[PDB]
Structures are given as C-alpha cells and as structure tokens.
Design a protein around this ligand. Structure first.
Ligand SMILES: *[C@@H]1O[C@H](CO)[C@@H](O)[C@H](O)[C@H]1NC(C)=O
Ligand SMILES: *[C@@H]1O[C@H](CO)[C@@H](O)[C@H](O)[C@H]1NC(C)=O
Ligand SMILES: *[C@@H]1O[C@H](CO)[C@@H](O)[C@H](O)[C@H]1NC(C)=O
Ligand SMILES: *[C@@H]1O[C@H](CO)[C@@H](O)[C@H](O)[C@H]1NC(C)=O
Ligand SMILES: *[C@@H]1O[C@H](CO)[C@@H](O)[C@H](O)[C@H]1NC(C)=O
Ligand SMILES: *[C@@H]1O[C@H](CO)[C@@H](O)[C@H](O)[C@H]1NC(C)=O
Lengths: 106, 123, 119, 119, 119, 123, 106, 123, 106
C-alpha cells in the first residue's frame, strides 16, 4: 500500500496538501499517480490523472505534483463542499498493476 | 455524460460463488479497458481486476488471482465478474470502472476514468 | 530417404520432416517450372508466417480441435494412420482450419502488442 | 477484401493485414513480371528479418519515435489518418527509420549473444 | 561497404553482417541468373530455418564444438583470423556441422512440443 | 504383464552419492515416461523425479533438484538415478514407475501405470 | 501435500469413502487425481487413474469421483482382502508435477 | 602495466545521491567488462555491479538493484556509477575493476583482473 | 556468502591452506573460483583466477584447487611479505553473479 496521512484539515480558503508516499518502484519509476475524491456513501470521482492533469469538469483548485518518490495533491480555495476522503493511486508495473493508499479524511 | 450500473447479490456463505455484472451506457464500451475495484466496509479501496478493451487479456490482484474470472461482452455492452470462494477478507463494495489500460494505439491511461456506484457483497 | 516415411504412420513419419523440407526446394518451360516451384514454396512459407509458425516445422497453436473434423482417438491418428490417409480425411476441412489459424494468430499478435504497451 | 481498408483509418486498417499479405504473393515478359514480384516479396521479407521481425505482421521495436518525423498525437495518427496519408507524411524519413531499425536489431543480437555467453 | 570487412578479422567482420545480407538479394540467360540467385538465397534461408535460425543473423545453438574440426583458441579464431581463412579451414567439416545442427534442432522441437503438452 | 526391478545399495554416509538402476521388461521401454517415487520408512510416498520417454527432458521435486540426476537408456531398457548429498531426510524406499507423462502425440496420463518393488536407501 | 483422513473403517460389504482434499490449483483446476492401493511391505498398485477411470484388472468396486476441490474414492463391497493403505495423487502443474496425500489405513 | 583511478565524494545524507567515476589507462577500455565491488569499513568486500564491454548490458546486486545506475563511455575511457538513496548499509569503499565478463567471442573470465584503489563513500 | 576461516597462521616456509566452502550452486556447479590478496589499506590484488590458474606476475607459491563444493588456496614457502587478508570469489550464475567469502587474516 501507499502511505497517506489519516487526516488533514484546514480553514476555508486555505491551501491544503495531501501527501502520498510510496517506494522507488511505485511513485519514482512511474509518473502515473492519480487522485480520487470519495464522498461518504458514494463511489470515488477522479480528480487528478497523470501527475499534473485534470479531467474535464474538475476545477483548477486541484493541482497535482510529484517530487522524488512522494506525490502531492494541493487543494487551493478550501470549501466545505470539497470535504471528502481522498485517495492516491499509483501504477506499480506489469506484475502488480495498481497500489492504492489509505484514505485521507478532509 | 456516461452511466455505469452495478448488479449483484448480497450475503453468501464462505466457499460459495457469486456473479456480478455491470451495464455501460453513454460511451463506446469496446473502446475502453474495464476494471473492478473494491472497498471493504471499514477500509480504503483497492484494485481487484483489469480486463482489456477486446477482452482477450485479463489481470488480477494476487489475493483473488486463483478464484475470480473477469469477462466482458462488447455486443451487450456488459462486464461480468464471477467470484468463487468468497472469504471474509473479500467482503466489500465492488465498483466497475472505465480506464486502467489502453490497447497500444491509444493514449495511455493507468487511471480509472469513470465509476459506477458499487455492488455490496458480504460473507 | 525422400518420402521414405510416406507409408509409415504419422508418429514415426513426423521424425523425418527435414528430409522433405530440404527436398522441396533443392528452355522457357523449365524456367517457368522453376519459378512456379519457388512460388509454391513461398506460398507455404508465407502461410506458416501468417500463423506465427515461420521458423518451425512442428508448430503448436491455440486453435482447439472441433472433433467434427475427425473424431478419431489420438492414438488411432498417430499410431495407426499414415499422413496420406489423414490428408484424405481432413481435406474437406482444411480451409476451415487454415482460416481459424489465421484468425488465432491475428488475435495473438494484438494481445502481445497490448501486453508490450503496458509499461 | 483486398485493400478494402485502404480508405479506413490506420487503427481499423491494421486489423486486416493478412488479406494484403496473402494477396501480395498469390511469354518472357510475364515470367519476368513473376520473378520481379518474387524478388520484391523477398526484399520485404529480408528487410523484416534484418529488423528481427521475420515472423510477425505487427512487430514492436526498441527505436524511439523522434517526433520530428511526425509530431501528431497518437490518437490523431491512429483514429483520424489513413495509411496512405501517413505514408505520404513519413516517406521523407522512411530511410532514416529503416537505418535506425537495422542498427537497433544489430545491437539487440549482440546483447542477446552476450547474455547467452554467461553461464 | 559490401565485403569491406572481408579482409578484417572475424570479430570485427561480424559487426557488418547486414551489409552482405542486404546485398545478396538486391534475355533468357539473365532471367535464369535471377531465378538462380533467388533459389540460392532461399536455400540458405531454408537451411537457417531447419536449424531454428530463421530470424537471426547471429544464431546460437546447442551443438558442442568437437575441437577436432579446429583446435585453435577462441581468441586466435576471432582476433587473428579472417572469415576466408576460417572457411578454408572448416570446409572439410561443414557438412558434418550442418548435419549436427539439423539433428539438434529436430530434438529441440520435439522437446518443446513435449513441454507444451504438459498442462 | 510387465516386470520392473530396482537395483541399488543400502547405507551411505551423509554427503556421499549412490546410483540406483531399474530394468524393465514386458513393455516397450522407449514408449513410456518413467518416474521415481520415494516413501520414507514412517511416512507416505512422494514424487521424486520424472523423465520423458526419449530422455531429453527431466523434472525434479525441489527438495532434490540440485543433487539428483535422472537418465534413461532406451537401448538397454534401463532407468538410472544418480543421487548426491544423501541427507537424513532423503532416507526412503525408492520405486521406479512407468507413467507420469506422455510425449504430446499419445493420450495423457499424469499417473503412474506400473510399479517396481523398491530399493531401500538409508543414511 | 494433500489432506486425507489418517484412518477409515467399516464393516464388510459396506460402502467406504476416502476423501482427498487439496487446493484450487491441485484438485480443482486439474482433473487428474489418481488413487493407489499399497499393501504393507509392497509397492503401491494403481486403482484409479483420471477422476473416474479404472486400469484393466481392477474391479468395479473402486469408483472415483470429484466435486469442487475434493476427490473421493468409494469402495463398495468392502472385504478383508482389500484392506490396504490408500493414497491420492494429484497433478499440480508444470512447476510442481505431483502432490501426494497421507496414507489412509483401511 | 595499467592504471585505474577512482574519483568521488565523501559524506552524504541518507536519501541523497552521488556519482562516482573511474578513469582507465594502459589497456583498451572498450575490450573489457567493468565491475564495481565495495568493502564496508569493518567487513569483507562484495560485488555491487557489472557492465559489459559495449555497455548495453548491466547487472546489479539485489541490495542496490533499484537505485544504482552503471554506465561507461568508451570514447572517454571512463566508467560511471550513479548511486541514489545511499543508506547506512551502503557505506563502503567502492573499487572499480576490469574483468567479470566477456562478450561471447573472448575467452571467459568471471574474475576481476585489474583493480583501482577505491573511493570512500560514507553516510 | 561463502565460508572461510576467520584466521589462518603458520611458520615461515610452511605450506598454509585457506578453505572456501560454498553450496552446490556456487563452487560445485561452476569451476570459476578466484582468490584475491588484500593488504591493509590497499585494494585487493588477483592471485588466482579459474580453479588452478595464476595471472602473470604471481609466483608459483599460490596454488589453487577444488574438491566437491570446497575450494582451497595453498601458499607454499610462507613469508612475512605475503601476509594479507585473503578472499575467495565464486561465480554463482546469471541471476546472482558473484559471491565473496569473509576475509582470512594471515
Ligand atoms: C510397414 O508396415 C509394417 C507392419 O508391421 C511395419 O513394420 C513397417 O515398418 C511399415 N513400413 C514403414 C516404412 O514404416
Ligand atoms: C464445429 O463445426 C461445426 C460445423 O461447422 C460448427 O457448427 C461447430 O460450432 C464447430 N465447433 C467448434 C467448437 O468450432
Ligand atoms: C468512410 O468514412 C465514414 C465516415 O463516418 C466511415 O463511417 C466509413 O467506415 C469509412 N469507410 C471505411 C471503409 O472505413
Ligand atoms: C531527430 O532528428 C533530428 C534531425 O535529423 C536530429 O537532429 C535529432 O537528433 C533527432 N533526435 C532523435 C532523438 O533521434
Ligand atoms: C588490415 O590490417 C591492419 C593491421 O594493423 C589493420 O589495422 C587494418 O584494420 C586491417 N584492415 C581492415 C579492413 O580491417
Ligand atoms: C569428433 O570427430 C571425430 C571424428 O569424426 C569423432 O570420432 C568424435 O567422436 C567426435 N567427437 C564429438 C564430441 O563429436
């Protein structure tokens, strides 16, 4: 699994970052680390695909980045409407396809 | 823009089997790879299986590799998963998702583009 | 010897395939005969290539036997029959088998291409 | 149908390669025409062999795409273009690509030879 | 250059095999000459196919070197000798080597067939 | 209908070696695959090794894979097993058996059709 | 190894079943589960080959079956002459060829 | 007869990186395979990596397989090793050596023929 | 790793042997067991390559041998000038290339 903080918080309007830490074979070697936003009782929605890309329909508040073996999702302009459990998902290779981290409650 | 809806049963006994099925609408089913992802009631979600767009190639997570069969029908626009030996560790809500792979001539994905709402399977 | 195994059963006959393979290739009418022999050789090699068998004499495939083509037991086919009797029995289904082999190889090549695409 | 996919996009057209592959081979002037057709077929098969593609219709390689040859998106090339337009675009760089493919295969064969030497 | 390495040692000369491979293929008497050139090319390709070397220029095998054919050191053969001197030395044993290569490939194909039979 | 008779030695020291040999009669030796199966004095029997009918292919159980060599001679109608580094865990009665494999053109087996009586090897 | 009962018994003339339990990769996937009858001091004799077949010379008292991942040998018409240690043997695959169970004393 | 001289840095932090380089003289660099061997300050020496003479093939010891990159330049007559995630278990003196492999057409080696004096890398 | 004695000693002029013990996949299967002589503060020098060969420049005092899965280096004519830490190195295969033993202090 990937390592994520169990809980992140901040004031409305604050820039909030969620870290996703993996090993050299997960985040480092492969630049395919996506982020999903899951509201309680609902299926997750895709927020970030690739290291820096956003699917159409997702606002620019969600900005992805990667450094070394650690990926990060920055949510600017924090609002109550965007509070959800966030997950990172990394491509691990051909033998193991995807590794998900624990959810971060925001 | 699209619809993906899970169909399946509920409680089963250990050692049994259960077939799940998803119907797709609003996109060309045969143009995208499909995956199953599951979330235990008290845990985060994890990848279960991946099938290519044509359906010839299948991949599984090791914890289910010897029991689960993933199959798709591009004429019906449906995805099926036949699970056997449902263990207590396999209790989860199972979501169908569009994405996770591309057939060499398409731009890469390695992400799950569209999601259904999930079938809840218990043991 | 060339075709020495022709009257031998399929099992024993399959051990001498290189003898015939080597013998197949080894005025205007004679030149036409030589060109035709070359064209026939190449048609057989191309057909093997299409099936993914370009470098083998005994090539295993992914096409299942229907059993309607011939429902004989495997020991009957390989230990009691000769290749001529077998060809006489299968000639009615040979084009069906070839079509299935071509389709199977096309599917295999697409599947390998997709596996190679995964990084 | 032979060349039926000629006006079809590259993606869909790549699914019928065996139709053209089979059709390529299937007085003194006519005999010369037949010999020339055979020589052209063999030149293409030899070239595939040099690249390590002797048994495949869709052959993956280790030569990276420069992007200067064509900077179109992969979906534009495979879903919107036909093979004729693509050939018209790449013909200026075809000899460069072929040279790179030959060099890559020579390096691969030497590397496999060295890996096989390790006991 | 074509045959430019002919006077070069075997080691360095083995790096230019594609030059000769490409050059080998590239009135009634001239047409006969072209047909004969094609037949010779195909005989060499068929022979490589029989040995399981249909797609390679440098093909490794399972036939051990007897040392009676030539007892020179490996560095003497590859760093001091040219390919012409080597061919002059081995021509007396070339048919023996070819026979062993054919038998080895037949055994390998039967062994692969049996391994594929295991389910 | 057939005869298969084990020949071999008895007690050896740890770290040594011992060659066992079986002679076959009553069937065509070259037409069948051969295996070795061993039974410890107080345990059940387990598979040790398998050789094809031609003899080109050999397979071993992991516990002996790096020490034992299986070989057959179709002109002599004999099967040999050369064992090295006989350990105390390798003490057993070793039986030769006909079956366990078929050379692709024969009906499948995956069973041991005929058995000898067994050579007892101790350490 | 495969799981077998250490001991099975019954009255003469009774139908006696011996179970052989393996995993999905042994009995389930491959329908090549044979049974052997070993008398004390002697080499085992083949009783059942394949799931349901009998070698010639073996009477119809020995009837094999398979369900799920469990194989079974039924011996009808139990007699003292047929008391022996019974073993099951399953084909495991290409990496591992055969797996034997423990003997069942009857 | 020959000279091989290590160049490199000293103390690094855990999680960082360091590139080492060796220059060769007195022999044809492109004719020999090169390896890196390391010795911890209080332990014996062990193999770290191997590169072929051409440089196309590289091999690593498992303990560094996912971090270290070995590269050679036959025009400069130099060997480079780029190390990442230097751990405390990776502190050692790193020696360059000529040998360890041959490119199929040369007599076998499987030994380290010539050695440098060693760069000391600490964490 | 390979097994070597931590320390070996003897009188000047004595024949001194250093053992190197490995498994069947290291010393037994592959006859490529070399020996190196490392003086304190210096890089090791190659003494023996292959089972029995000496690089040019190395005297005949250093004689290698192999029996079973154990390799040995015999140093005849022991002198103070040849005291060093000795190592054995064996070729292990294609998956694992070289295995070194512990140093023997002489
Ligand atoms: C012809 O049939 C007989 C029947 O026993 C057989 O022995 C012989 O080998 C056969 N001929 C050939 C060439 O196999
Ligand atoms: C076998 O051939 C018959 C007649 O062509 C066809 O109906 C049947 O589906 C075939 N079966 C298989 C498995 O190909
Ligand atoms: C020609 O273009 C149309 C455009 O929609 C397409 O539907 C049709 O399939 C094309 N023809 C072929 C042979 O693909
Ligand atoms: C691409 O082509 C240009 C022009 O020939 C050349 O300068 C450049 O180095 C090439 N790049 C690659 C990666 O081959
Ligand atoms: C001819 O021999 C000389 C001897 O040194 C060598 O340098 C030269 O490269 C050789 N010619 C070729 C074409 O290799
Ligand atoms: C080498 O050739 C000689 C003469 O043909 C032959 O007697 C000998 O057995 C051969 N050895 C091998 C290993 O092939």
């Amino acid at each position: 699994a990937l390592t994520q903080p169990p809980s992140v918080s901040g004031s409305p309007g604050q820039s909030v970052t969620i870290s996703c830490t993996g090993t050299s074979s997960d985040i480092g070697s492969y630049n395919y680390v996506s982020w999903y936003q899951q509201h309680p009782g609902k299926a997750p929605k895709l927020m970030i695909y690739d290291v820096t890309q956003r699917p159409s329909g997702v606002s620019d508040r969600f900005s992805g980045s990667k450094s070394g073996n650690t990926a990060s999702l920055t949510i600017s302009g924090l609002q109550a409407d965007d509070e959800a459990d966030y997950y990172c998902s990394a491509y691990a290779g051909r033998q193991t396809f995807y590794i998900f981290g624990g959810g971060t409650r925001l | 823009e699209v619809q993906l809806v899970e169909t399946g049963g509920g409680l089963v006994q250990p050692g049994g089997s259960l077939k799940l099925s998803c119907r797709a609408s609003g996109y060309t089913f045969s143009s995208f790879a499909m995956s199953w992802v599951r979330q235990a009631p008290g845990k985060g979600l994890e990848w279960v299986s991946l099938i290519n767009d044509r359906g010839g190639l299948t991949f599984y997570v090791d914890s289910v590799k010897g029991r689960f069969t993933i199959s798709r029908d591009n004429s019906k626009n449906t995805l099926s998963l036949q699970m056997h030996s449902l263990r207590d560790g396999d209790t989860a809500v199972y979501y169908c998702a569009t994405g996770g792979m591309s057939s060499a001539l398409q731009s890469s994905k390695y992400y799950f583009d569209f999601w259904g709402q999930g079938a809840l399977v218990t043991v | 010897g060339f075709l020495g195994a022709a009257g031998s059963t399929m099992g024993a006959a399959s051990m001498t395939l290189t003898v015939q393979a080597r013998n197949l290739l080894s005025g205007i009418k004679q030149l036409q005969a030589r060109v035709l022999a070359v064209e026939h050789y190449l048609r057989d090699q191309q057909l093997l290539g299409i099936w993914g068998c370009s470098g083998k004499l005994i090539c295993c495939t992914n096409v299942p036997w229907n059993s309607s083509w011939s429902n004989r037991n495997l020991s009957e086919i390989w230990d009691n029959m000769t290749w001529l009797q077998w060809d006489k029995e299968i000639s009615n289904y040979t084009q069906i088998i070839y079509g299935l082999l071509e389709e199977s190889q096309n599917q295999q090549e697409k599947n390998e291409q997709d596996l190679l695409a995964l990084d």
